[PDB]
Design a protein that fits this description.
- Interacts with PRKCABP. Interacts with CNOT7 and CNOT8; indicative for an association with the CCR4-NOT complex. Interacts with PIN1, inducing mitochondrial depolarization.
- One of its GO terms (molecular function) is transcription corepressor activity.
- This is Protein BTG2.
- By secondary structure, the protein is α+β, with helices and mostly antiparallel strands.
- It has one domain: Actin, Chain A, domain 4.
- The protein contains five helices and four strands; from the N terminus they run αααβααβββ.
- Strands 1-2-3-4 form a four-stranded antiparallel beta sheet.
- A hairpin with a 2-residue loop joins strand 2 and strand 3.
- Helix 1 runs antiparallel to helix 2 and helix 2 runs antiparallel to helix 4.
- The longest helix has 19 residues.
């Protein structure tokens, strides 16, 4: 019931966007992926409750508005991506919900809710 699959799906989504929209070597994309996985599992450790998936949902949520998510920012820094470049490469107004058994996202305040990952408990 551990948090890796949901977090790796989230991270794979953000990586894919860097790969697609950017010019980032796989070496860097791999550093970013592992580092973001570790960052987020540290971040979610005490805020993960498999039996009540919406509990802690707001805390775990990854937002990109006019400020970049601070964990994305610092991990991305680790591979030499500045926040302004992230802003350019990643969608505007992105919301990424990373909950037990379900990863989902929205591009834009009024975009569709897409499911990245769903699995049965």
């Amino acid at each position: 019931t551990d948090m890796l699959p949901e977090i790796a799906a989230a991270v794979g989504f953000l990586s894919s966007l860097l790969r697609t929209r950017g010019c980032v070597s796989e070496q860097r994309l791999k550093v970013f992926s592992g580092a973001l996985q570790e960052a987020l599992t540290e971040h979610y450790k005490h805020h993960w409750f498999p039996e009540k998936p919406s509990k802690g949902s707001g805390y775990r949520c990854i937002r990109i508005n006019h400020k970049m998510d601070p964990i994305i920012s610092r991990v991305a820094s680790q591979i030499g991506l500045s926040q302004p470049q992230l802003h350019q490469l990643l969608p505007s107004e992105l919301t990424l919900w990373v909950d037990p058994y379900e990863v989902s996202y929205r591009i834009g305040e009024d975009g569709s809710i897409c499911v990245l990952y769903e699995e049965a408990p």
